[PDB]
Write a protein that binds this ligand. Structure first.
Ligand SMILES: NC(=O)c1ccc[n+]([C@@H]2O[C@H](COP(=O)([O-])OP(=O)(O)OC[C@H]3O[C@@H](n4cnc5c(N)ncnc54)[C@H](OP(=O)(O)O)[C@@H]3O)[C@@H](O)[C@H]2O)c1
Ligand SMILES: NC(=O)c1ccc[n+]([C@@H]2O[C@H](COP(=O)([O-])OP(=O)(O)OC[C@H]3O[C@@H](n4cnc5c(N)ncnc54)[C@H](OP(=O)(O)O)[C@@H]3O)[C@@H](O)[C@H]2O)c1
Ligand SMILES: NC(=O)c1ccc[n+]([C@@H]2O[C@H](COP(=O)([O-])OP(=O)(O)OC[C@H]3O[C@@H](n4cnc5c(N)ncnc54)[C@H](OP(=O)(O)O)[C@@H]3O)[C@@H](O)[C@H]2O)c1
Ligand SMILES: NC(=O)c1ccc[n+]([C@@H]2O[C@H](COP(=O)([O-])OP(=O)(O)OC[C@H]3O[C@@H](n4cnc5c(N)ncnc54)[C@H](OP(=O)(O)O)[C@@H]3O)[C@@H](O)[C@H]2O)c1
Ligand SMILES: Nc1nc(N)nc(N)n1
Ligand SMILES: Nc1nc(N)nc(N)n1
Ligand SMILES: Nc1nc(N)nc(N)n1
Ligand SMILES: Nc1nc(N)nc(N)n1
Lengths: 249, 248, 248, 249
């Protein structure tokens, strides 16, 4: 029987690439999304046309709040409801925008940037474990955490807390046979808002090929970590960055 | 005149030691507290006996909430009001307790652990910078990569605090504000910890089989705020007697 | 045409499993050995029974010395002479024994421990690049920051190997040669070791309270040389079942 | 009885500043040097003019070889011979030059770069410990070890091995009360051979003041680590880089 995976923020870009690759490997998938309903449903439709009844969507805001635990509980419940099991969780959804130190309130920015990057992964990890073979969680981290974007303090804090979660959860869940790992892109799909000149500035920094990672290349590392070829790997974060993090200023 | 420092959670233990050493170095000090009013005021009394009107207290809950930004703004403001300047911020206040993955609600645990260890430091940092040998020192944790079992939220908080230290060092460098950390291993053990478990921890420490005194932790803070650290920013100084080097 | 790989110290244990898994994946292999001729040849004969003319052995001492550069050039040249190409280099061979600070001379210890773990990888890297999905995989150690007591030279050698992996990744990226590491925690235990001492290590590992098989270490090498890792360079994959996360 | 310190490569630049500040703090000093004899003797003259019988020179090549152990033993012995004790060892001497992967032979480049940066510190640490209060060793590391200079592999390997030595020796020597720490400069005194345009490029990269560290600012972190205010600190490396290592490519 086929295993099942939850991928958060899976309607487009890297999340979709991960969902597609998991599906192609034989997984049934929960495509979680927040605002991108049309894109989520379109993806699910495509996957179901490939194999009937192997993809569902699940909407949730992952901003921190007093109901976020219930929302995260429900995302995991959706996978059991659809598929009768949940073997893999991929924590991909992520808010990403500057929060300079010197029209959202700061409370809102904290809730979105720390909620999506750290607290939702933590809650989803609790629910995934409590509901529980090759079980694992993969956290989408960031290879540039130690050389961060200027004025992205809250985003950086969130990704650092996600490294902490990866370690803490690997240590604590190892007795239950749940592995917990991360994949840390350097530059992959650039933001849709970014102009080509700015994109090329980033591309030219990358030693290996002077180009960003494809979404599929990030997905490849995720697929590795969930596979039987990684059955002794837990608490590891695989950088997928073409050498970018090695390049001094 | 004399420089001024804000120390969060300064009533007891490591915070108190840090406040005392800054004061002894010549700083005027804002002694922040949440529940420990009596201890905070007693420290203030002691420091003001030494030099009149050089210590004040400031109460605030640092749990994450809708009012946390205003609370952090007011802590920084209290330093400007008392002393007309704020040269140093020490982010020491910290909740510490287990949050297993498998009667506080989980959202309260998130608010307290991530609030005290990360979000409050962030807001205090914003307010401190907006109001401007200026520096910030964050109390980190040498065991972040080898964490206590079932302490995931605490560990996330401390990791986020490393992130803030790096991001703020980078962004505040142009303003001449240095941002560093001190990472204790085992210092003063929890009051709740039984003496047998305390001894198990002490015996793990390569350098002297004992915990760091609060004063030993404060020494590294004093270094980091001093003119001997004027080129140091984005650095976290481990003060753990080699504990983090010891394998399982 | 089938690609070709050099695996150092490939006669036994992890290097043998790497060589076998590469061979199963379709590589022709140079099985480097130092003292284990019989085991090297038996592996070669086995692989060649599977597919004719797909394995050769190559003897060399990787101790540091003024002939080490030529020995390393010769190892690489052997792969070209056998197979007309060299796609993959696996730096696996490694001396490992204590060197306390307080019958081998210290300079022999330095030559063996630094030569096998660091300088030989460096020279083999040079020769591999000069001769050019090309990649190098260095066998590192998940415990370099929490090292075995009295293994300073070994630990220095493994840290230097991390430096090599990063510096070579950076410098060889323009030629399309990726350079990565795999860092075991506890894998195959020393053959010497009593089961009672073996079990002490096994019990420290969160994930399954057992050591990694050589095949599990090999699986990570196979991933890193594969098309699924085409954008990965300068990365060290820990394969340690959580061992390195466990405090003292 | 004043304490005594050995500083390697102490005739010029950073090692000189360290020797001077240690002396100002009350230490007697062995000024080790290799080629800079005039400078070494001139420094020793200055220190002794300030307090008689408080400085000696010691010449030694720290290139790796079969006689490196004896040379390192001799450096430590020189401190006991002059001062009757040896409280502090500062591993500062260092070769620094590129060694591309693609007039010195490679054997020589390995010997000089790995010898000075890693093997000499190791043998000096061994001799120091065997000859044995506030005892400590301070290793001059490099903040840029993870974002290395292009084509400096052997130098980088040497500095990484020195991080390994700092940790391993801190662990093993802790029961003897000998602390082992490091100081990791980013950009400090630039190479004498470096053109001024290049020095300025480097300076512009440093967030904290857009200037390199003085030798004195590096020395300040060394004197902190040797001092009574660092008595619980062992196995720590203090970055003194003005934020340089935080800046992405
Ligand atoms: N792209 C890169 O170069 C890069 C670099 C380093 C790290 N990463 C990491 O890799 C992962 C994927 O990157 P990406 O660029 O594909 O991500 P992204 O496009 O910026 O965001 C992925 C999804 O996150 C979801 N999301 C945002 N806010 C949310 C909220 N409040 N509640 C629930 N979901 C929310 C969105 O879902 P909806 O669209 O449905 O609203 C969005 O499609 C992220 O974790 C990212 O940090 C990416
Ligand atoms: N002690 C150690 O061995 C050790 C080890 C590693 C890291 N550290 C770090 O070093 C620092 C000092 O350690 P410590 O053991 O002295 O700390 P602590 O005693 O656990 O806590 C310090 C103070 O934090 C304040 N605090 C707690 N929750 C708060 C809240 N919601 N709002 C405002 N303040 C709150 C409390 O002030 P009130 O009493 O006034 O309520 C408390 O006295 C902490 O950052 C800690 O993480 C310590
Ligand atoms: N086993 C573990 O638990 C563990 C843990 C962490 C890291 N690792 C790393 O994983 C790798 C493989 O480990 P392993 O236990 O399989 O290694 P190993 O058995 O200790 O040694 C591998 C081979 O290295 C070769 N070697 C030793 N000295 C040499 C010299 N002077 N010149 C040439 N070759 C020499 C030997 O070849 P001959 O037999 O032909 O003489 C030996 O069979 C090593 O890099 C090791 O550090 C292993
Ligand atoms: N300068 C920087 O920006 C910077 C940046 C990162 C790290 N660091 C580290 O800080 C420390 C001091 O830096 P620095 O720039 O002052 O060093 P440096 O000037 O490049 O070297 C200092 C001394 O090392 C000695 N030395 C070189 N090769 C030797 C050998 N084979 N045997 C014995 N001694 C040898 C030389 O002594 P003689 O002149 O007597 O021959 C030289 O004066 C070094 O460990 C360095 O790697 C410095
Ligand atoms: N969420 C997110 N994170 C990063 N690092 N980059 C983009 N484009 N989105
Ligand atoms: N806040 C806090 N953090 C730690 N690590 N230890 C103690 N006792 N308190
Ligand atoms: N070479 C080697 N290295 C380690 N770490 N362990 C064993 N058994 N051998
Ligand atoms: N030995 C040495 N090392 C560095 N990093 N820089 C200079 N100038 N010298």
């Amino acid at each position: 029987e086929a295993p099942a995976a939850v991928v958060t923020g899976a309607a487009k870009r890297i999340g979709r690439a991960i969902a597609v690759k998991l599906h192609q490997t034989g997984y049934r998938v929960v495509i979680h999304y927040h605002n991108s309903a049309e894109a989520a449903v379109s993806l699910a439709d495509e996957l179901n046309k490939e194999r009937s009844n192997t993809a569902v969507v699940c909407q949730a805001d992952l901003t921190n709040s007093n109901v976020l635990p219930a929302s995260c509980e429900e995302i995991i419940n959706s996978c059991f409801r659809a598929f009768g099991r949940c073997d893999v969780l991929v924590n991909n959804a992520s808010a990403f925008y500057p929060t300079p130190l010197v029209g959202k309130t700061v409370e809102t920015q904290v809730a979105e940037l720390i909620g999506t990057n750290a607290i939702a992964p933590f809650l989803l990890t609790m629910s995934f474990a409590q509901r529980q073979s090759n079980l694992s969680i993969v956290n989408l981290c960031d290879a540039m955490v130690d050389q961060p974007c200027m004025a992205f303090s809250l985003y950086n804090m969130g990704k650092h807390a996600l490294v902490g979660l990866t370690q803490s959860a690997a240590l604590e869940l190892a007795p239950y046979g749940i592995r917990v790992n991360g994949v840390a892109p350097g530059v992959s799909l650039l933001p849709v808002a970014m102009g080509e000149e700015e994109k090329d500035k980033w591309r030219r920094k990358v030693p290996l090929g002077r180009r960003e990672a494809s979404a599929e290349q990030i997905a490849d590392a995720v697929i590795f970590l969930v596979s039987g070829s990684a059955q002794y790997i837990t608490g590891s974060i695989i950088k997928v960055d073409g050498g970018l993090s090695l390049v001094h200023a």
